[PDB]
Amino acid sequence: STGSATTTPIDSLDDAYITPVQIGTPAQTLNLDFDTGSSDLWVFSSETTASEVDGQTIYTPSKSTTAKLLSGATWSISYGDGSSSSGDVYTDTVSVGGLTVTGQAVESAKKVSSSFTEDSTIDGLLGLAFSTLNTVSPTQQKTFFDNAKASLDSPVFTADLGYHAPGTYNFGFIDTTAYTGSITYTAVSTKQGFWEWTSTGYAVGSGTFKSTSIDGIADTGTTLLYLPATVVSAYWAQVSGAKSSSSVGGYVFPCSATLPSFTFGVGSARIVIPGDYIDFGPISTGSSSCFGGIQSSAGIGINIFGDVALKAAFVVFNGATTPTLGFASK
Ligand SMILES: CCNC(=O)C1CNC1
Ligand SMILES: CCNC(=O)C1CNC1
Numbered sequence: 001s002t003g004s005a006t007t008t009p010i011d012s013l014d015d016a017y018i019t020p021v022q023i024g025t026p027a028q029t030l031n032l033d034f035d036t037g038s039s040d041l042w043v044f045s046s047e048t049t050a051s052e053v054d055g056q057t058i059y060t061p062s063k064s065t066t067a068k069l070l071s072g073a074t075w076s077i078s079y080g081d082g083s084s085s086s087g088d089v090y091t092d093t094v095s096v097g098g099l100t101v102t103g104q105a106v107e108s109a110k111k112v113s114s115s116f117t118e119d120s121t122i123d124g125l126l127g128l129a130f131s132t133l134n135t136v137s138p139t140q141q142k143t144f145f146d147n148a149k150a151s152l153d154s155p156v157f158t159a160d161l162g163y164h165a166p167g168t169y170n171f172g173f174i175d176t177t178a179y180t181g182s183i184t185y186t187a188v189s190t191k192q193g194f195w196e197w198t199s200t201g202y203a204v205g206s207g208t209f210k211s212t213s214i215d216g217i218a219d220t221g222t223t224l225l226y227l228p229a230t231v232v233s234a235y236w237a238q239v240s241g242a243k244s245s246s247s248v249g250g251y252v253f254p255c256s257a258t259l260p261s262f263t264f265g266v267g268s269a270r271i272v273i274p275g276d277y278i279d280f281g282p283i284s285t286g287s288s289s290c291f292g293g294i295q296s297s298a299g300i301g302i303n304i305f306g307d308v309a310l311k312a313a314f315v316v317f318n319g320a321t322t323p324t325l326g327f328a329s330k
Helices: 144-151 229-236
Strands: 003-009 017-023 028-035 041-043 068-078 084-096 099-112 124-127 156-160 167-171 184-187 196-204 210-218 225-227 243-245 250-254 262-266 269-273 279-282 289-292 294-296 303-305 314-318 324-328
Touching (some): 003 084, 184 196, 229 294
Parallel strands (some): 028 124, 225 294
Antiparallel strands (some): 003 167, 041 124, 156 167, 196 210, 225 303
16 A cells, blocks of 8 residues: 655745545544654644633544444653643544554643644644654554554655745655655664664755764654754854854844755765745744754764754655664755
8 A cells, every 4th residue: 555645834934834634434634743763643633621722623522433442551851942732542543645554642732732722724734754652551552654564555755845845745655756866875773762863964055075974853743953062063053143042042144145055975875955045034923033953963862863954855654674764865
């Protein structure tokens, strides 16, 4: 089997991407944030505290003939941005782009933190990291990809995120029309439950490539690119007027600037992020200070290849017995 679904930016900045997912019988379609950095499929639901729902579409298990309460199971998750959610668990039929999994754990939110309530465009998350990170207790549950993988033509999914435009998530096959050149594959460590790999270095604009190992995670659920402070300082030093602002919480730059590109290494290959991908717009409405899309990881504990980096490539998440990552230009 295979599946193929379009993913759409939630706003004009590409702050996140939503993909429609069918849950239950008859289908209830929710727009979920596919997150290769976590491993829980959770949704706003008929059980979510009413004051914490503001425009989201909710899953109502009582209206699904295939929903079954997973007795005794609860979940609770805290994300790197300080947001959180928790609740109980059903199993149900879940379909993505024509690919169907029966018995998928659908985590129903009883509580969500303010940032989830405040984003009316995201009805939940669909985690695509390794199932060892799944928070369901006392019986840990599998991700949608893990449940699907034995049925797939090939045990892979691909992310092809757009810049200010829709993109595609494919399951079970690699669309050879969707990229240029060849795909370069690189080793993955699953020891932290992430798609963790080591970049071979970087360049700023037309500058020379610096060969240096940068361990980090491929995370579709993080907006920006978080790298060591040395690398980020070297990037922003090429933008007149750029500075790190403690009050704003990162590097800002004059909105009048033209940003240089940023290149990262994948083995001997190179992925070029165009400068425009690094512009996240005014820090507040009408400001001439703009927020940078490359930020320091120094306070995080891990480097993160988020959407800013991933949308410059066609990315293969290879879930073979020994997982690997693939990157191609496009
Ligand atoms: C389980 C914690 N995972 C995270 O915080 C990453 C950020 N995208 C999901
Ligand atoms: C309609 C889907 N669009 C895409 O997949 C584009 C190609 N890069 C993003």
